[PDB]
Amino acid sequence: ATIGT
Amino acid sequence: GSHSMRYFYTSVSRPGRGEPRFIAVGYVDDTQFVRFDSDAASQRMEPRAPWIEQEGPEYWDQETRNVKAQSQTDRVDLGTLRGYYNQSEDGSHTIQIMYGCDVGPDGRFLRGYRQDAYDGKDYIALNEDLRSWTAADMAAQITKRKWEAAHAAEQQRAYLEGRCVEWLRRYLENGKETLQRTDPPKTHMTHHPISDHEATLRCWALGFYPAEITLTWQRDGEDQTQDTELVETRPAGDGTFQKWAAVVVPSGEEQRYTCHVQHEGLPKPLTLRW
Amino acid sequence: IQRTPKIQVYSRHPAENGKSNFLNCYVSGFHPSDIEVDLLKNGERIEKVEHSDLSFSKDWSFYLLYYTEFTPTEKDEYACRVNHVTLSQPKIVKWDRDM
Amino acid sequence: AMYK
DSSP states (O other): OOTTO | OOEEEEEEEEEEOOTTSSSOEEEEEEEETTEEEEEEETTSSSOSOEEOSGGGTTOOHHHHHHHHHHHHHHHHHHHHHHHHHHHHTTOOSSSOOEEEEEEEEEEOTTSOEEEEEEEEEETTEEEEEEOTTSSOEEESSHHHHHHHHHHHHTTHHHHHHHHHTTHHHHHHHHHHHHTHHHHTOOBOOEEEEEEEEOSSSEEEEEEEEEEEBSSOOEEEEEETTEEOOTTEEEOOOEEOSSSOEEEEEEEEEETTOGGGEEEEEEOTTOSSOEEEOO | OOBOOEEEEEESSOOOTTSOEEEEEEEEEEBSSOOEEEEEETTEEOSOOEEOOOEEOTTSOEEEEEEEEEOOOSSOOEEEEEEOTTOSSOEEEEOOTTO | OOOO
């Protein structure tokens, strides 16, 4: 899961 | 049995031909599992490994959000950097970002990364302490001062030591059957005369995972590079890798040469001889 | 900075006439990312060619895999044609199935 | 918020 959350 | 998760983002301006193009890909070790392409019709983060497909709508929505946001951020940053470098509006330029985390066999955090490039050269990078930045040039020092004022290193650290690691663990469990597998190389040799006095020997490794491998030619038990060619390790297209190493030898002296194959999936390194 | 592509054209499996396989063209180590790669059968561009999602290496250079299902025969010649700003003319690499 |  990508950064941003 | 250390493992990594990495995301790779590319933004490329294309002045007079629409908005910049943005591509994102994610990997666990040497296995891709997601993609996004700003030019594709879906405008969604899309699965590319079977073990991610079980993730629910919330996951896909959130991942799509995050990469869309980065694409838009990069559109601003491309303009900014063209200004820092005093470049014209007519040239294409590229921003690249890589980030991610490594875990140990225990599943515990080992290391995090975030590094950024401009036109294929280092621009700024998070240091290994996850608290400070290294700027490659005077333009990136401008960014560095902003990012210190913004406390950006703390937000990166929180992700890299947190969410990054947690999700890498989840994927390692969910995709265990394929991610935690090693597939040793299947090896063979080829042999071709090239003149009345030389012949080529080529040592092949096929079907292996993960990609890391070493192939070395020796003559009389000594590693050699004279008259050798080693290709880049390359994808088979089925999730495994391939590599070969070749040596030109004096005709009749093939038996003096050995190819040594090292790979995590092998019980012991292989020695091949024609 | 520009970096020219390293180009390899190869089959997924060792080739056997009449047996279905995949023809690959792997381009790596290039910059900038704009590139055009075609697979050729007897000099003609193959229509159904797919490619991987753009990614890059530790030195920021790019890589891509282009690929198509095929069945090799004795008489059909295959090649990959790579068009990149670093190449004055497209580079055409012939498939050598006996390497 | 992180802008270059």
